[PDB]
Amino acid sequence: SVRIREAKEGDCGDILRLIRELAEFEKLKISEEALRADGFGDNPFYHCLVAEILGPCVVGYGIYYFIYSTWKGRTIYLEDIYVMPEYRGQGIGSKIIKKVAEVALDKGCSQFRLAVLDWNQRAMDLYKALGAQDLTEAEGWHFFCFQGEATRKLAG
Amino acid sequence: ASVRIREAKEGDCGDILRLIRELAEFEKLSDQVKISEEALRADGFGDNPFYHCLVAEICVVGYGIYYFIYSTWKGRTIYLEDIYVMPEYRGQGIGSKIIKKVAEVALDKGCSQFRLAVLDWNQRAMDLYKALGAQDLTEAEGWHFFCFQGEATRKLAGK
Numbered sequence: 001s002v003r004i005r006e007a008k009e010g011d012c013g014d015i016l017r018l019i020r021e022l023a024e025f026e027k028l029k030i031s032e033e034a035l036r037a038d039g040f041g042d043n044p045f046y047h048c049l050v051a052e053i054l055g056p057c058v059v060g061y062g063i064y065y066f067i068y069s070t071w072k073g074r075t076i077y078l079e080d081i082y083v084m085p086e087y088r089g090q091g092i093g094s095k096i097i098k099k100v101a102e103v104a105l106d107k108g109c110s111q112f113r114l115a116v117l118d119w120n121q122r123a124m125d126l127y128k129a130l131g132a133q134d135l136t137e138a139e140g141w142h143f144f145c146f147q148g149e150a151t152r153k154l155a156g
Numbered sequence: 157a158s159v160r161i162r163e164a165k166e167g168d169c170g171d172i173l174r175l176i177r178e179l180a181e182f183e184k185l186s187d188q189v190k191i192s193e194e195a196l197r198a199d200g201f202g203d204n205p206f207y208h209c210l211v212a213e214i215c216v217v218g219y220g221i222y223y224f225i226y227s228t229w230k231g232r233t234i235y236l237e238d239i240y241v242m243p244e245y246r247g248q249g250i251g252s253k254i255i256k257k258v259a260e261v262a263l264d265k266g267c268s269q270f271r272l273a274v275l276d277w278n279q280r281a282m283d284l285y286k287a288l289g290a291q292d293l294t295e296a297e298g299w300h301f302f303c304f305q306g307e308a309t310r311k312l313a314g315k
């Protein structure tokens with residue numbers, strides 16, 4: 001059986017390995033130390049869920065944080081979600097998503113957001129199957145990012 | 157018109173909501189505004205705020221709402237969630253002043269990643285952002301914005 005649960009500091013090694021797997025899957029600077037500090041700190045920057053087979057082994061994860069919508073208020077953003085290849089298509093990713101929804105309601109967040117690459121149609125299809133809307137396709141939203149000098153020029 | 161851009165205070169939340177509702181009403185989407193003044197107060201002005209807000213003041217005539225995010229690709233990032241200026245005050249550079257200020261906040265915190273979403277009708281904005289060195293990630297990289305809205309979320313959570 002599989003359980004989705006809050007990460008503990010002891011999971012940081014396993015989580016770092018899985019972050020590296022998802023980064024490679026997506027085709028492109030965090031230490032185990034940074035994870036422990038940022039993900040559990042005071043003051044945590046983000047929150048991690050692990051999928052664990054019941055010794056027990058961690059086979060997937062999600063990372064989310066709290067954001068905001070001006071129409072709806074408190075919102076969660078699901079940043080990373082990943083299940084190891086051997087463990088895909090046995091409901092684990094859907095269970096991680098359901099857990100994020102449960103956490104959302106528990107924390108007074110009516111809705112949750114994510115970003116996904118348009119080549120990743122199997123993921124997009126799952127999110128649509130679970131009730132999500134593609135607002136890029138529906139409304140025309142384009143993500144922009146300024147880095148380094150671009151942000152400096154933006155700041156005039 | 158003479159305008160200042162300043163940090164919002166808890167007492168500006170009535171005005172922020174009035175502006176959000178004015179936009180929604182303009183778009184014929186009034187029924188979609190579920191946020192409350194009490195939420196803007198609680199979510200913005202307690203110990204761990206969900207957002208930060210700059211207002212444009214002559215009468216508050218505009219706002220920019222942002223928050224920080226942690227991207228597993230680039231680390232700490234500022235994300236501009238929304239900028240609105242009342243139509244009567246459009247053409248006066250107020251929106252440009254707000255975005256400039258948000259960019260300065262990022263830099264002041266020692267963060268140089270800035271992210272936002274822009275609607276595709278807004279060619280003026282898109283052209284300027286590219287000219288400044290920004291990348292359109294949707295066009296460049298195929299990023300799509302997904303949202304599990306209220307009904308979908310409740311269903312997933314087993315209601």
Ligand SMILES: CC(=O)SCCNC(=O)CCNC(=O)[C@H](O)C(C)(C)COP(=O)(O)OP(=O)(O)OC[C@H]1O[C@@H](n2cnc3c(N)ncnc32)[C@H](O)[C@@H]1OP(=O)(O)O
Pocket residue numbers: 022025078079080081082083084087088089090091092093094095114115116117120122123125126129
């Ligand atoms: C928000 C951002 O992080 S988007 C990034 C999403 N992450 C990835 O694409 C990493 C690689 N893939 C995975 O981690 C997983 O396959 C996930 C998270 C996408 C889906 O989780 P799983 O446990 O495999 O899926 P689950 O069993 O809950 O089933 C749903 C669907 O997954 C999708 N899927 C993606 N890859 C597979 C796969 N290898 N095998 C079976 N289904 C897959 C399909 O849409 C399937 O739908 P269907 O049953 O109607 O045919």
